[PDB]
Amino acid sequence: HEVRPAIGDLETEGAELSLVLRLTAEPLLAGVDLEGVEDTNDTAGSGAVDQLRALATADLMARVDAEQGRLLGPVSVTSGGTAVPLTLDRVEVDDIENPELPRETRLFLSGTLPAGAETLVVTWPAEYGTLILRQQGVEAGFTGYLTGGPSEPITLAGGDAWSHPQFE
Ligand SMILES: [Cu+2]
Ligand SMILES: [Zn+2]
Ligand SMILES: [Zn+2]
Ligand SMILES: [Zn+2]
Numbered sequence: 001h002e003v004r005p006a007i008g009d010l011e012t013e014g015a016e017l018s019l020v021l022r023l024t025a026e027p028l029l030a031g032v033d034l035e036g037v038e039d040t041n042d043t044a045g046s047g048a049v050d051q052l053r054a055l056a057t058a059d060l061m062a063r064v065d066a067e068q069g070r071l072l073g074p075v076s077v078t079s080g081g082t083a084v085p086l087t088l089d090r091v092e093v094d095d096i097e098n099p100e101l102p103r104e105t106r107l108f109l110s111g112t113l114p115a116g117a118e119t120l121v122v123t124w125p126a127e128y129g130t131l132i133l134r135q136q137g138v139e140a141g142f143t144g145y146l147t148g149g150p151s152e153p154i155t156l157a158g159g160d161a162w163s164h165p166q167f168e
Helices: 025-030 044-055 057-066 068-072
Strands: 006-012 016-023 076-079 086-095 104-111 119-124 131-135 144-145
Touching: 006 119, 025 044, 025 057, 057 068, 057 086, 057 104, 119 131, 119 144
Parallel strands: 006 131
Antiparallel strands: 006 016, 016 104, 076 119, 086 104, 131 144
């Protein structure tokens, strides 16, 4: 199965953080090192991915809800060096019966930023492959190509994050 970048949509509405991950769950659950992987068929866990592909959409979801600790452990948001713990609120899985096609899984993550937050850093592990982190709800917002370790700092919208320059 061709490996595509995960896509992450990050939005803040004051202190409320949403991160929505568009991803392929099957490699992440099988434990496959996705770093420099173009196709899961060229990895040792190919059969493990393909067994996971065979499950119904409801089974895949409950397995994602059941293993969130392992899956989300190395995914972190910090803001001013304070950890911003993420909750898994919701899980979608596309229903594609053709087993030779990958299906998208979406994770809906939320947290609360500290009072007065101005920047956050997202950390994604190299083992999970590329993440294209897009900041939503802002003109000329942050884009990042996360291949392992911390993002560059993401500048936040909203009243708390504003700074008045010393002169106009
Ligand atoms: Cu395959
Ligand atoms: Zn590695
Ligand atoms: Zn939906
Ligand atoms: Zn909004």
